[PDB]
């Protein structure tokens, strides 16, 4: 047992930033590295094109939000906490394969 946690600080940093992504659909935390200046869409561009995804396919939005975050924003603003990825309800061309059906 025994658990804990630590805090973080926010100071100016002119260098490539990185962040984690929540694979809701999947089950694992991924990391994304890219320049801060760049946007969330331009930084994911080489990620979506490298993941067979798209900017109009995936959806970025922190854990416990109301609306999907704007990629237009610089990753420099998404380099602290872990984000969440809401993949589309359909994917064929992609790495790995682990999904199940559902009903109600």
Curated annotation (Swiss-Prot):
Reported modifications of this chain: Phosphorylated by PKC. Phosphorylation is increased in presence of forskolin and may enhance the GDI activity on G(i) alpha subunit GNAI1.
Disruption phenotype: No visible phenotype. Mice show an enhancement of postsynaptic long-term potentiation (LTP) responses in the CA2 neurons of the hippocampus that is correlated with an increase of spatial learning and object recognition memory (OMR).
Stretches assigned to the RBD domain: 18-88
Localization in the cell: Nucleus; Nucleus, PML body; Cytoplasm; Membrane
Tissue-specific expression: Expressed in pyramidal neurons of the CA1, CA2 and fasciola cinerea (FC) subregions of the hippocampus and in the olfactory cortex (at protein level). Expressed in brain, spleen, heart, liver, lung, kidney, skin and thymus (at protein level). Expressed in granular layer of the cerebellum, forbrain, striatum, layer V of the cortex, olfactory cortex, tubercules, subthalamic and hippocampus, particularly in the CA2 region, to a lesser extent in the CA1 region and the external layer of the dentate gyrus. Expressed in neurons.
SUBUNIT field: Interacts with GNAI1 and GNAI2. Interacts with GNAI3. Interacts with GNAO1. Interacts (via RGS and GoLoco domains) with GNAI1; the interaction occurs in the centrosomes. Interaction with GNAI1 or GNAI3 (via active GTP- or inactive GDP-bound forms) prevents association of RGS14 with centrosomes or nuclear localization. Interacts with RABGEF1; the interactions is GTP-dependent. Interacts with RAP2A; the interactions is GTP-dependent and does not alter its function on G(i) alpha subunits either as GAP or as GDI. Associates with microtubules.
Purpose: Regulates G protein-coupled receptor signaling cascades. Inhibits signal transduction by increasing the GTPase activity of G protein alpha subunits, thereby driving them into their inactive GDP-bound form. Besides, modulates signal transduction via G protein alpha subunits by functioning as a GDP-dissociation inhibitor (GDI). Has GDI activity on G(i) alpha subunits GNAI1 and GNAI3, but not on GNAI2 and G(o)-alpha subunit GNAO1. Has GAP activity on GNAI0, GNAI2 and GNAI3. May act as a scaffold integrating G protein and Ras/Raf MAPkinase signaling pathways.
Free-text comment on this protein's domains from its UniProt entry: The RGS domain is necessary for GTPase-activating protein (GAP) activity for G subunits and localization to the nucleus and centrosomes.
Protein name: Regulator of G-protein signaling 14
Native source species: Mus musculus
């Amino acid at each position: 047992g025994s658990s804990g946690s630590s805090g973080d600080q926010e100071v100016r940093l002119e260098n490539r930033i990185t962040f984690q992504l929540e694979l809701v659909g999947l089950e694992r935390v991924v990391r994304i590295s890219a320049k801060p200046t760049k946007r969330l869409q331009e930084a994911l561009q080489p990620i979506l094109a490298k993941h067979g995804l798209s900017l109009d396919q995936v959806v970025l939005h922190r854990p416990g939000e109301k609306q999907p975050m704007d990629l237009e924003n610089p990753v420099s603003s998404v380099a602290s906490q872990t984000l969440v990825l809401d993949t589309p309800p359909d994917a064929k061309m992609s790495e790995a394969r682990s999904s199940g059906p559902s009903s109600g």
